[PDB]
Amino acid sequence: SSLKIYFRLLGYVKPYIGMFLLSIVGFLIFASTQPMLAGILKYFVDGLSNPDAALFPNLRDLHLVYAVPLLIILIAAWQGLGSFLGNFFLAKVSLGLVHDLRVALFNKLLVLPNRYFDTHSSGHLISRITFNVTMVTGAATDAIKVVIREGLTVVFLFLYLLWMNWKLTLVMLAILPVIAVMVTTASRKFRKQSKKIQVAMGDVTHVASETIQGYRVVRSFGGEAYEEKRFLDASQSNTDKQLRMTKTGAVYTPMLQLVIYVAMAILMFLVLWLRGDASAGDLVAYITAAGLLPKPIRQLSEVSSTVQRGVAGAESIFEQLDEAAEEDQGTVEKERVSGRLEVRNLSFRYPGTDKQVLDDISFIAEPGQMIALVGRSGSGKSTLANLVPRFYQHNDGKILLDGVEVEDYRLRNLRRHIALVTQQVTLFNDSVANNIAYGDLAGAPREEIERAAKAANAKEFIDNLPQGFDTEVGENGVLLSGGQRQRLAIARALLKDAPLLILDEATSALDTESERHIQAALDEVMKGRTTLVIAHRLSTIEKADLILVMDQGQIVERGSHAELLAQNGHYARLHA
Amino acid sequence: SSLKIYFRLLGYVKPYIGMFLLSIVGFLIFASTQPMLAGILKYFVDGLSNPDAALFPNLRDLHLVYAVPLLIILIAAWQGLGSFLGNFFLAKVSLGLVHDLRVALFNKLLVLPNRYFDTHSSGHLISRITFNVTMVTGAATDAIKVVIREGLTVVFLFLYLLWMNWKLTLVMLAILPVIAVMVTTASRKFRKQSKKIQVAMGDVTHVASETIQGYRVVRSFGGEAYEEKRFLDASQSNTDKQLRMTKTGAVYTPMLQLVIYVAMAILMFLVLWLRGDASAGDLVAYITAAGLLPKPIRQLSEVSSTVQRGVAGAESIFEQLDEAAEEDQGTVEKERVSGRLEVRNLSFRYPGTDKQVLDDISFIAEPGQMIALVGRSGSGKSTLANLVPRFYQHNDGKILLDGVEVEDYRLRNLRRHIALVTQQVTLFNDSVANNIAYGDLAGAPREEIERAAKAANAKEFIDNLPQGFDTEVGENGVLLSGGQRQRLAIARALLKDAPLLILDEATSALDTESERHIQAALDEVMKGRTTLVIAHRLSTIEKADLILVMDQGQIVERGSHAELLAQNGHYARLHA
Ligand SMILES: [Zn+2]
Ligand SMILES: [Zn+2]
Ligand SMILES: [Zn+2]
Ligand SMILES: [Zn+2]
Ligand SMILES: [Zn+2]
Ligand SMILES: [Zn+2]
């Protein structure tokens, strides 16, 4: 939980270096006014005795009665300029870093591997690009402003005190070592407590996420009591840990102030006891300047905890940015491909496991040919179909599309040549038309969109919708039925005319007649495409050119409907 | 965007009223020290002339040389006590309100209607109970601390100035009207800009949510460019709007400080010009106290924007808490029910629509009877089955369970008597056993859990898992296959032995043989339960006692397999 993680933020402050320099200049101006405001008291005291005296004798008329009031205004304006220049330009830099960090994180998500999204929950990932960035940057920005403003102020004040009387200033200098030791001890405590508070807050988020995501299960199978108890315990821990940090700071700041004022007391005793020929105004200015030291130290003490509290978020932000991305070392970029797909001795095991999902799988697909896949509820049908789009990296075997290994193709170009209907249908919260035409096919004419819907036997329900093809499907298509959502997904794939079309159980939520209207229209456009089908209903794959039956990651049988039935094996048992 | 929303927070500060009073007492102590620190300068100046003078003549020996230094220490300790009492106890109250608000929001989610979760996205809801609460409460807490501390400090200082010389203090009093006008104008700007920044931030979250949730669609159908462009535009708007608010504050604070110092300049001119018989120390103390006014006003000016920035979140937090909950005015709470379910002239239309999903539906179910439902990809099969658990409220018709309308049953008791397998399988990120036994059936012996798994034809794959029944399924069961996940859900329902069992397409992701092993075990425990089945495979419902075919929300045919086939209607066409 070191604060060194903040050093990484500097890489994003390079383009804003010039603006940051201006902020320092403004803070310098503001800091310089603080000693000036103390010095004017010297002349004011002298003026009280003799207001007719002239402030400058070598102007050369302006008496203290008018000069001292005038200087007050000028110093105030000078301080105001520094305040605006420092606060405005520093915020420019801060907001720029927020924008850069957010954009970088979002782009990283678009390139991270599927496993990352698989392991982490959506609530985890969204919090990083909406709240963590703001909190981390805000804490750092406040710290920078205080350290620059209060550090300069202290430096200027000490320099002024040293100029007036270096001997007495030594007393104030001796407190600096004491303050440093106290700051060190407090920081050690803050970091430890910050670790604890961090883990507790994460548990709170986890209980909430598990509930806002599986509300239906909680309602139906009970568990409101179980879930409420978990959240209560989690929240209690976070509050207790957070209070523990407050108590430490509530004693930390007062102690340091006491040290300063104890030292100030000593200094005043010396001035009152061992008084020289110094004028009363000289002494008043010195004491006044010393009294302007406690304020900056208090502000620094307060930020000492804020920095230690934002480190946790920075660690997570700078972890996703360092996460490894999908391997895309290929260069080949063909405009179009014939559609021939060949797999040769392909064996895969999910990363972080020891089970061989698939082993020694070989099959050749040619344009205009239909390939069907059947299995036993987990034979690896969905795993093999997710290796062609290179969603998961394969190490053994060779997957070749149009004669070139899928690895040699640039990820974007390869995925452009393949259209896939995943088993889990997912629909954005937008119009039916916008969902049917997303990304590459975006902007397609309405006529083409409607044509694809007709093929998916979707136009009928889409037309009866309240606003036609412009109706909003709702969040994840909740406003639509399960089979209706599946048909919309089929339409999206049909619109993206690609040489290879993969469909993984695209008729699971459709009846026997609606599924027929889809297979009766897919066979008329199968001549210019290579079709891969993974289905459990042994009725839409009878006309497939080649049918592959898998059993525990191995292809046990090959052939067609007639040959497979004649063999009287796994296919014969499954068909019955 | 009024700040009046914060007034609602007061309802949660009632239990912490006592601690809040102590915080005020501490802040009073701290504020009282500020004028004291200025007054000591009067005696210090007098001491410079005559340190042998006694501070108290009526003690009665302690000279200024020792008394003045001693008082400095005592004031510092007094200030320290007030600081701890104010800062610690105020934080106690603040953290308590955070805990209360979070707990209330979580419990509200457990009672909100399904439509709410349906419309709002998970990212929206999770942000309210993790970040918005912290931000809103933190902003209010900082504001309260500053207004209490700086308001008191200003009051004490003005009282001291009035005591020393009321006539001159009038000059400082005249600036108060000017400051008030400036604060009013600035707040009007802040609120308007805060509205704009709020909407922009929401758009940023929305683009992120649509991406962290549909990453697979973005990868497969392109759209990385489309999505990145959207996020960039959204982030640009937020940054620009946020900067607009910074510039206003960067001019707001310096102007107010200039007003104060201009007034201070006038006061000093008067003292220097029209000097009476007042001692130099008296005048020095007065000027010193006046110079302690600019600091508090600056801090108040800074918080003037922070409050206006947290209002947006408070509006959302206090909106969910006001959202209407599910109607649960029933009182009946039976321990067990026979399982007879009767629907009489039930007609439903989803709230906010004009389409009649279902109309004039009547059917009677008895214990030990099997009821099957068939339809045409959206006839309303899933809508009718979600009215028995009272997920959606019905207005026309009567749904009676065991002779009592489902409305008269307490929601918890009614849902305890019904076991449902939804079409969308959802699994928590925990062990297989913990998912199979969740909520009411939690703590069941391992033997019972395994028995249920055997019935769902799940033990076979569960045993072959790395850690057996203790393996973690992963987030939403990603580590498990689709059919495997469905079988786990079936097991959960089987464990929760209930009089009524509803299954909506529980074999969509299963093959013809695995589905047979489930129907061969479900028929042996169907005598003591009432089963409702909504399936598209016309092979597991042939043995159903009554089969109901729906067509656009109306039951068109009734009977059994033989009678329905003889009729040669919708069932005959669908079966083929
Ligand atoms: Zn995560
Ligand atoms: Zn989690
Ligand atoms: Zn699958
Ligand atoms: Zn929402
Ligand atoms: Zn949204
Ligand atoms: Zn349905």
mmCIF file with all atom_site columns, C-alpha atoms in Angstrom, chain A residues 44 48-49 65-66 68-69 76 84 88 91-92 95 99 102 106 109-110 112 114 117-118 121-122 125-127 130-131 201 209-210 212-213 215-222 224 227 231-232 235-236 239 242-243 246 250-251 265 268-269 272 275 295 326 376-377 412 420 424 428-429 438 440 475 478 487 492 496 512-513 516 573-574 576, chain B residues 44 48-49 65 68-69 84 88 91 95 99 102 106 109-110 112 114 117-118 121 125-127 130-131 201 205 209-213 215-222 224 227 231-232 235-236 239 242-243 246 250-251 261 265 268-269 272 275 287 295 326 376-377 412 420 424 428-429 438 440 475 478 487 492 496 512-513 516 573-574 576:
data_model
loop_
_atom_site.group_PDB
_atom_site.id
_atom_site.type_symbol
_atom_site.label_atom_id
_atom_site.label_alt_id
_atom_site.label_comp_id
_atom_site.label_asym_id
_atom_site.label_entity_id
_atom_site.label_seq_id
_atom_site.pdbx_PDB_ins_code
_atom_site.Cartn_x
_atom_site.Cartn_y
_atom_site.Cartn_z
_atom_site.occupancy
_atom_site.B_iso_or_equiv
_atom_site.pdbx_formal_charge
_atom_site.auth_seq_id
_atom_site.auth_comp_id
_atom_site.auth_asym_id
_atom_site.auth_atom_id
_atom_site.pdbx_PDB_model_num
ATOM 1   C CA . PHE A 1 44  ? 1.653   50.184  10.864  1.00 0.00 ? 44  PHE A CA 1
ATOM 2   C CA . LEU A 1 48  ? 0.732   54.690  15.056  1.00 0.00 ? 48  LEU A CA 1
ATOM 3   C CA . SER A 1 49  ? 3.530   56.666  16.713  1.00 0.00 ? 49  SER A CA 1
ATOM 4   C CA . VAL A 1 65  ? -1.226  57.233  6.801   1.00 0.00 ? 65  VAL A CA 1
ATOM 5   C CA . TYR A 1 66  ? -1.915  56.690  3.095   1.00 0.00 ? 66  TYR A CA 1
ATOM 6   C CA . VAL A 1 68  ? 0.254   51.531  4.459   1.00 0.00 ? 68  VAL A CA 1
ATOM 7   C CA . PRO A 1 69  ? -3.459  51.285  3.472   1.00 0.00 ? 69  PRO A CA 1
ATOM 8   C CA . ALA A 1 76  ? -4.350  41.540  -1.954  1.00 0.00 ? 76  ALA A CA 1
ATOM 9   C CA . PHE A 1 84  ? -6.398  32.119  -9.913  1.00 0.00 ? 84  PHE A CA 1
ATOM 10  C CA . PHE A 1 88  ? -7.247  27.211  -12.504 1.00 0.00 ? 88  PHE A CA 1
ATOM 11  C CA . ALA A 1 91  ? -7.282  21.903  -12.335 1.00 0.00 ? 91  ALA A CA 1
ATOM 12  C CA . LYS A 1 92  ? -6.731  21.996  -16.106 1.00 0.00 ? 92  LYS A CA 1
ATOM 13  C CA . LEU A 1 95  ? -9.013  17.136  -15.454 1.00 0.00 ? 95  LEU A CA 1
ATOM 14  C CA . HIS A 1 99  ? -9.701  12.168  -19.261 1.00 0.00 ? 99  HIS A CA 1
ATOM 15  C CA . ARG A 1 102 ? -10.468 7.035   -18.411 1.00 0.00 ? 102 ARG A CA 1
ATOM 16  C CA . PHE A 1 106 ? -11.797 1.940   -21.801 1.00 0.00 ? 106 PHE A CA 1
ATOM 17  C CA . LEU A 1 109 ? -11.102 -3.240  -22.023 1.00 0.00 ? 109 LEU A CA 1
ATOM 18  C CA . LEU A 1 110 ? -11.645 -3.467  -25.785 1.00 0.00 ? 110 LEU A CA 1
ATOM 19  C CA . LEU A 1 112 ? -8.257  -7.462  -22.859 1.00 0.00 ? 112 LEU A CA 1
ATOM 20  C CA . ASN A 1 114 ? -12.160 -12.849 -22.712 1.00 0.00 ? 114 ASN A CA 1
ATOM 21  C CA . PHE A 1 117 ? -14.130 -10.377 -18.375 1.00 0.00 ? 117 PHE A CA 1
ATOM 22  C CA . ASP A 1 118 ? -15.050 -13.962 -17.466 1.00 0.00 ? 118 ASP A CA 1
ATOM 23  C CA . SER A 1 121 ? -17.647 -9.137  -12.439 1.00 0.00 ? 121 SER A CA 1
ATOM 24  C CA . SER A 1 122 ? -19.210 -6.257  -14.352 1.00 0.00 ? 122 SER A CA 1
ATOM 25  C CA . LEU A 1 125 ? -14.922 -3.272  -13.963 1.00 0.00 ? 125 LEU A CA 1
ATOM 26  C CA . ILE A 1 126 ? -17.442 -0.417  -14.209 1.00 0.00 ? 126 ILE A CA 1
ATOM 27  C CA . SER A 1 127 ? -16.357 1.052   -10.860 1.00 0.00 ? 127 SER A CA 1
ATOM 28  C CA . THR A 1 130 ? -16.435 5.839   -13.216 1.00 0.00 ? 130 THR A CA 1
ATOM 29  C CA . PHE A 1 131 ? -15.458 6.333   -9.573  1.00 0.00 ? 131 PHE A CA 1
ATOM 30  C CA . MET A 1 201 ? -15.157 -1.902  1.242   1.00 0.00 ? 201 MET A CA 1
ATOM 31  C CA . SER A 1 209 ? -23.226 -7.188  -6.723  1.00 0.00 ? 209 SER A CA 1
ATOM 32  C CA . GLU A 1 210 ? -24.355 -10.738 -5.938  1.00 0.00 ? 210 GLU A CA 1
ATOM 33  C CA . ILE A 1 212 ? -28.375 -6.711  -7.816  1.00 0.00 ? 212 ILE A CA 1
ATOM 34  C CA . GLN A 1 213 ? -27.519 -9.491  -10.276 1.00 0.00 ? 213 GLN A CA 1
ATOM 35  C CA . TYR A 1 215 ? -32.424 -10.780 -7.460  1.00 0.00 ? 215 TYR A CA 1
ATOM 36  C CA . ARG A 1 216 ? -34.774 -13.355 -8.989  1.00 0.00 ? 216 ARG A CA 1
ATOM 37  C CA . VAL A 1 217 ? -33.008 -16.262 -7.272  1.00 0.00 ? 217 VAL A CA 1
ATOM 38  C CA . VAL A 1 218 ? -33.057 -14.406 -3.941  1.00 0.00 ? 218 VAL A CA 1
ATOM 39  C CA . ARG A 1 219 ? -36.795 -13.719 -4.282  1.00 0.00 ? 219 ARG A CA 1
ATOM 40  C CA . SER A 1 220 ? -37.767 -17.234 -5.364  1.00 0.00 ? 220 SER A CA 1
ATOM 41  C CA . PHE A 1 221 ? -35.567 -19.465 -3.172  1.00 0.00 ? 221 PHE A CA 1
ATOM 42  C CA . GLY A 1 222 ? -35.530 -17.197 -0.141  1.00 0.00 ? 222 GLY A CA 1
ATOM 43  C CA . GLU A 1 224 ? -33.412 -12.160 1.864   1.00 0.00 ? 224 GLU A CA 1
ATOM 44  C CA . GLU A 1 227 ? -28.279 -11.613 2.084   1.00 0.00 ? 227 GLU A CA 1
ATOM 45  C CA . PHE A 1 231 ? -24.483 -6.918  3.962   1.00 0.00 ? 231 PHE A CA 1
ATOM 46  C CA . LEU A 1 232 ? -24.955 -5.808  7.574   1.00 0.00 ? 232 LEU A CA 1
ATOM 47  C CA . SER A 1 235 ? -21.032 -2.622  6.361   1.00 0.00 ? 235 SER A CA 1
ATOM 48  C CA . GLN A 1 236 ? -20.330 -2.865  10.097  1.00 0.00 ? 236 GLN A CA 1
ATOM 49  C CA . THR A 1 239 ? -17.589 1.600   9.400   1.00 0.00 ? 239 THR A CA 1
ATOM 50  C CA . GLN A 1 242 ? -13.047 3.797   8.909   1.00 0.00 ? 242 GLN A CA 1
ATOM 51  C CA . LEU A 1 243 ? -13.657 5.160   12.415  1.00 0.00 ? 243 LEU A CA 1
ATOM 52  C CA . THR A 1 246 ? -10.572 8.998   12.057  1.00 0.00 ? 246 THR A CA 1
ATOM 53  C CA . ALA A 1 250 ? -8.230  13.435  15.367  1.00 0.00 ? 250 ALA A CA 1
ATOM 54  C CA . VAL A 1 251 ? -5.237  13.129  17.729  1.00 0.00 ? 251 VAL A CA 1
ATOM 55  C CA . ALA A 1 265 ? 5.613   30.261  23.572  1.00 0.00 ? 265 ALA A CA 1
ATOM 56  C CA . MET A 1 268 ? 7.931   34.913  22.936  1.00 0.00 ? 268 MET A CA 1
ATOM 57  C CA . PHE A 1 269 ? 9.530   34.379  26.354  1.00 0.00 ? 269 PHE A CA 1
ATOM 58  C CA . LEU A 1 272 ? 10.138  39.551  26.246  1.00 0.00 ? 272 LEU A CA 1
ATOM 59  C CA . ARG A 1 275 ? 14.924  42.392  24.552  1.00 0.00 ? 275 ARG A CA 1
ATOM 60  C CA . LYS A 1 295 ? -2.073  27.131  9.744   1.00 0.00 ? 295 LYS A CA 1
ATOM 61  C CA . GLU A 1 326 ? -4.856  -10.552 -26.592 1.00 0.00 ? 326 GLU A CA 1
ATOM 62  C CA . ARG A 1 376 ? -23.206 -35.081 -24.921 1.00 0.00 ? 376 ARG A CA 1
ATOM 63  C CA . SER A 1 377 ? -23.929 -31.948 -22.846 1.00 0.00 ? 377 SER A CA 1
ATOM 64  C CA . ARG A 1 412 ? -9.934  -7.629  -36.442 1.00 0.00 ? 412 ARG A CA 1
ATOM 65  C CA . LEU A 1 420 ? -21.227 -16.252 -34.907 1.00 0.00 ? 420 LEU A CA 1
ATOM 66  C CA . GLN A 1 424 ? -26.085 -16.762 -24.708 1.00 0.00 ? 424 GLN A CA 1
ATOM 67  C CA . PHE A 1 428 ? -28.052 -3.802  -26.410 1.00 0.00 ? 428 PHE A CA 1
ATOM 68  C CA . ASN A 1 429 ? -30.661 -1.378  -25.034 1.00 0.00 ? 429 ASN A CA 1
ATOM 69  C CA . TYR A 1 438 ? -24.427 -3.104  -35.171 1.00 0.00 ? 438 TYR A CA 1
ATOM 70  C CA . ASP A 1 440 ? -19.564 -3.069  -39.339 1.00 0.00 ? 440 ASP A CA 1
ATOM 71  C CA . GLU A 1 475 ? -32.177 -3.683  -21.188 1.00 0.00 ? 475 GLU A CA 1
ATOM 72  C CA . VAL A 1 478 ? -36.106 -7.849  -21.426 1.00 0.00 ? 478 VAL A CA 1
ATOM 73  C CA . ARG A 1 487 ? -34.316 -14.603 -33.596 1.00 0.00 ? 487 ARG A CA 1
ATOM 74  C CA . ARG A 1 492 ? -27.720 -9.769  -36.839 1.00 0.00 ? 492 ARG A CA 1
ATOM 75  C CA . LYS A 1 496 ? -23.151 -9.565  -41.578 1.00 0.00 ? 496 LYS A CA 1
ATOM 76  C CA . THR A 1 512 ? -40.690 -26.936 -34.044 1.00 0.00 ? 512 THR A CA 1
ATOM 77  C CA . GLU A 1 513 ? -42.447 -24.745 -36.627 1.00 0.00 ? 513 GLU A CA 1
ATOM 78  C CA . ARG A 1 516 ? -38.474 -24.800 -39.648 1.00 0.00 ? 516 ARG A CA 1
ATOM 79  C CA . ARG A 1 573 ? -28.960 -43.557 -29.680 1.00 0.00 ? 573 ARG A CA 1
ATOM 80  C CA . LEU A 1 574 ? -29.142 -39.751 -29.600 1.00 0.00 ? 574 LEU A CA 1
ATOM 81  C CA . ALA A 1 576 ? -34.079 -41.848 -30.899 1.00 0.00 ? 576 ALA A CA 1
ATOM 82  C CA . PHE B 1 44  ? 2.770   41.117  24.619  1.00 0.00 ? 44  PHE B CA 1
ATOM 83  C CA . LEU B 1 48  ? 7.772   44.726  25.456  1.00 0.00 ? 48  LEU B CA 1
ATOM 84  C CA . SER B 1 49  ? 7.680   48.139  27.136  1.00 0.00 ? 49  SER B CA 1
ATOM 85  C CA . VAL B 1 65  ? 7.534   37.842  31.021  1.00 0.00 ? 65  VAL B CA 1
ATOM 86  C CA . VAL B 1 68  ? 2.122   35.709  28.505  1.00 0.00 ? 68  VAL B CA 1
ATOM 87  C CA . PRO B 1 69  ? 4.163   32.625  27.436  1.00 0.00 ? 69  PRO B CA 1
ATOM 88  C CA . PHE B 1 84  ? -10.668 16.427  18.902  1.00 0.00 ? 84  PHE B CA 1
ATOM 89  C CA . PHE B 1 88  ? -14.080 12.852  16.236  1.00 0.00 ? 88  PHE B CA 1
ATOM 90  C CA . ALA B 1 91  ? -17.241 11.777  12.112  1.00 0.00 ? 91  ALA B CA 1
ATOM 91  C CA . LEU B 1 95  ? -20.161 7.293   9.497   1.00 0.00 ? 95  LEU B CA 1
ATOM 92  C CA . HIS B 1 99  ? -24.186 2.884   7.491   1.00 0.00 ? 99  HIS B CA 1
ATOM 93  C CA . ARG B 1 102 ? -26.479 1.915   2.860   1.00 0.00 ? 102 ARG B CA 1
ATOM 94  C CA . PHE B 1 106 ? -29.978 -2.602  0.295   1.00 0.00 ? 106 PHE B CA 1
ATOM 95  C CA . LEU B 1 109 ? -33.721 -3.493  -3.252  1.00 0.00 ? 109 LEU B CA 1
ATOM 96  C CA . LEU B 1 110 ? -34.919 -6.725  -1.632  1.00 0.00 ? 110 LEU B CA 1
ATOM 97  C CA . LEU B 1 112 ? -38.597 -3.317  -4.927  1.00 0.00 ? 112 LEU B CA 1
ATOM 98  C CA . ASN B 1 114 ? -39.145 -6.801  -10.567 1.00 0.00 ? 114 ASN B CA 1
ATOM 99  C CA . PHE B 1 117 ? -34.613 -4.182  -11.743 1.00 0.00 ? 117 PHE B CA 1
ATOM 100 C CA . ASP B 1 118 ? -35.831 -4.856  -15.291 1.00 0.00 ? 118 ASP B CA 1
ATOM 101 C CA . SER B 1 121 ? -29.157 -1.574  -15.290 1.00 0.00 ? 121 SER B CA 1
ATOM 102 C CA . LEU B 1 125 ? -28.025 0.248   -9.002  1.00 0.00 ? 125 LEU B CA 1
ATOM 103 C CA . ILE B 1 126 ? -24.625 -0.851  -7.664  1.00 0.00 ? 126 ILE B CA 1
ATOM 104 C CA . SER B 1 127 ? -23.197 2.677   -7.918  1.00 0.00 ? 127 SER B CA 1
ATOM 105 C CA . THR B 1 130 ? -21.104 1.910   -3.070  1.00 0.00 ? 130 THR B CA 1
ATOM 106 C CA . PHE B 1 131 ? -20.087 5.379   -4.257  1.00 0.00 ? 131 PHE B CA 1
ATOM 107 C CA . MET B 1 201 ? -21.223 11.919  -16.125 1.00 0.00 ? 201 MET B CA 1
ATOM 108 C CA . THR B 1 205 ? -21.330 5.490   -17.199 1.00 0.00 ? 205 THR B CA 1
ATOM 109 C CA . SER B 1 209 ? -21.921 -0.245  -18.964 1.00 0.00 ? 209 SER B CA 1
ATOM 110 C CA . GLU B 1 210 ? -23.020 -1.135  -22.499 1.00 0.00 ? 210 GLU B CA 1
ATOM 111 C CA . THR B 1 211 ? -19.423 -2.255  -23.179 1.00 0.00 ? 211 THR B CA 1
ATOM 112 C CA . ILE B 1 212 ? -18.487 -4.132  -19.977 1.00 0.00 ? 212 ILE B CA 1
ATOM 113 C CA . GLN B 1 213 ? -21.723 -6.085  -20.451 1.00 0.00 ? 213 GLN B CA 1
ATOM 114 C CA . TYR B 1 215 ? -18.045 -7.256  -24.785 1.00 0.00 ? 215 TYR B CA 1
ATOM 115 C CA . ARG B 1 216 ? -18.581 -10.430 -26.821 1.00 0.00 ? 216 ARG B CA 1
ATOM 116 C CA . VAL B 1 217 ? -20.934 -8.689  -29.259 1.00 0.00 ? 217 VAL B CA 1
ATOM 117 C CA . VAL B 1 218 ? -18.489 -5.786  -29.641 1.00 0.00 ? 218 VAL B CA 1
ATOM 118 C CA . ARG B 1 219 ? -15.612 -8.190  -30.357 1.00 0.00 ? 219 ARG B CA 1
ATOM 119 C CA . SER B 1 220 ? -17.508 -10.389 -32.814 1.00 0.00 ? 220 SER B CA 1
ATOM 120 C CA . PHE B 1 221 ? -19.562 -7.875  -34.835 1.00 0.00 ? 221 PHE B CA 1
ATOM 121 C CA . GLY B 1 222 ? -17.043 -5.054  -34.709 1.00 0.00 ? 222 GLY B CA 1
ATOM 122 C CA . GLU B 1 224 ? -14.654 -1.113  -31.155 1.00 0.00 ? 224 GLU B CA 1
ATOM 123 C CA . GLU B 1 227 ? -17.782 2.330   -28.909 1.00 0.00 ? 227 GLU B CA 1
ATOM 124 C CA . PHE B 1 231 ? -16.810 7.129   -24.908 1.00 0.00 ? 231 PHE B CA 1
ATOM 125 C CA . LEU B 1 232 ? -14.426 9.818   -26.164 1.00 0.00 ? 232 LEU B CA 1
ATOM 126 C CA . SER B 1 235 ? -15.649 12.021  -21.615 1.00 0.00 ? 235 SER B CA 1
ATOM 127 C CA . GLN B 1 236 ? -14.858 15.226  -23.520 1.00 0.00 ? 236 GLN B CA 1
ATOM 128 C CA . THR B 1 239 ? -14.281 17.377  -18.723 1.00 0.00 ? 239 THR B CA 1
ATOM 129 C CA . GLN B 1 242 ? -16.262 20.285  -15.075 1.00 0.00 ? 242 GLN B CA 1
ATOM 130 C CA . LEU B 1 243 ? -13.668 22.865  -16.137 1.00 0.00 ? 243 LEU B CA 1
ATOM 131 C CA . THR B 1 246 ? -13.583 25.347  -11.865 1.00 0.00 ? 246 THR B CA 1
ATOM 132 C CA . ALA B 1 250 ? -11.218 30.277  -9.370  1.00 0.00 ? 250 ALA B CA 1
ATOM 133 C CA . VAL B 1 251 ? -12.575 33.836  -9.722  1.00 0.00 ? 251 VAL B CA 1
ATOM 134 C CA . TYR B 1 261 ? -8.809  43.199  2.341   1.00 0.00 ? 261 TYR B CA 1
ATOM 135 C CA . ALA B 1 265 ? -7.342  48.737  4.275   1.00 0.00 ? 265 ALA B CA 1
ATOM 136 C CA . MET B 1 268 ? -6.334  50.714  9.017   1.00 0.00 ? 268 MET B CA 1
ATOM 137 C CA . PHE B 1 269 ? -6.464  54.166  7.406   1.00 0.00 ? 269 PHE B CA 1
ATOM 138 C CA . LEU B 1 272 ? -3.752  55.608  11.613  1.00 0.00 ? 272 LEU B CA 1
ATOM 139 C CA . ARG B 1 275 ? -5.967  57.901  16.482  1.00 0.00 ? 275 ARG B CA 1
ATOM 140 C CA . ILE B 1 287 ? -6.039  44.701  13.510  1.00 0.00 ? 287 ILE B CA 1
ATOM 141 C CA . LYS B 1 295 ? -9.220  32.852  6.329   1.00 0.00 ? 295 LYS B CA 1
ATOM 142 C CA . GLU B 1 326 ? -44.268 -4.741  -3.998  1.00 0.00 ? 326 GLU B CA 1
ATOM 143 C CA . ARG B 1 376 ? -45.984 -20.210 -30.433 1.00 0.00 ? 376 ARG B CA 1
ATOM 144 C CA . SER B 1 377 ? -42.772 -18.385 -29.437 1.00 0.00 ? 377 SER B CA 1
ATOM 145 C CA . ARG B 1 412 ? -42.721 -14.665 1.521   1.00 0.00 ? 412 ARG B CA 1
ATOM 146 C CA . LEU B 1 420 ? -39.614 -22.362 -10.114 1.00 0.00 ? 420 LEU B CA 1
ATOM 147 C CA . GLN B 1 424 ? -32.678 -17.744 -17.760 1.00 0.00 ? 424 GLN B CA 1
ATOM 148 C CA . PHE B 1 428 ? -24.017 -17.358 -7.779  1.00 0.00 ? 428 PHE B CA 1
ATOM 149 C CA . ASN B 1 429 ? -20.200 -17.380 -7.660  1.00 0.00 ? 429 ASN B CA 1
ATOM 150 C CA . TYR B 1 438 ? -29.437 -21.603 -1.224  1.00 0.00 ? 438 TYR B CA 1
ATOM 151 C CA . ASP B 1 440 ? -34.369 -21.763 2.861   1.00 0.00 ? 440 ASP B CA 1
ATOM 152 C CA . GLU B 1 475 ? -19.100 -15.914 -12.024 1.00 0.00 ? 475 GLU B CA 1
ATOM 153 C CA . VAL B 1 478 ? -19.027 -19.435 -16.547 1.00 0.00 ? 478 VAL B CA 1
ATOM 154 C CA . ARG B 1 487 ? -29.049 -29.048 -14.526 1.00 0.00 ? 487 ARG B CA 1
ATOM 155 C CA . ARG B 1 492 ? -31.883 -26.373 -6.638  1.00 0.00 ? 492 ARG B CA 1
ATOM 156 C CA . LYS B 1 496 ? -36.726 -27.106 -2.235  1.00 0.00 ? 496 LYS B CA 1
ATOM 157 C CA . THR B 1 512 ? -32.377 -36.048 -26.052 1.00 0.00 ? 512 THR B CA 1
ATOM 158 C CA . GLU B 1 513 ? -30.803 -38.597 -23.688 1.00 0.00 ? 513 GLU B CA 1
ATOM 159 C CA . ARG B 1 516 ? -34.737 -38.452 -20.617 1.00 0.00 ? 516 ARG B CA 1
ATOM 160 C CA . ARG B 1 573 ? -49.022 -29.232 -36.515 1.00 0.00 ? 573 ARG B CA 1
ATOM 161 C CA . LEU B 1 574 ? -46.530 -28.436 -33.742 1.00 0.00 ? 574 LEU B CA 1
ATOM 162 C CA . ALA B 1 576 ? -44.898 -32.922 -36.514 1.00 0.00 ? 576 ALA B CA 1
#
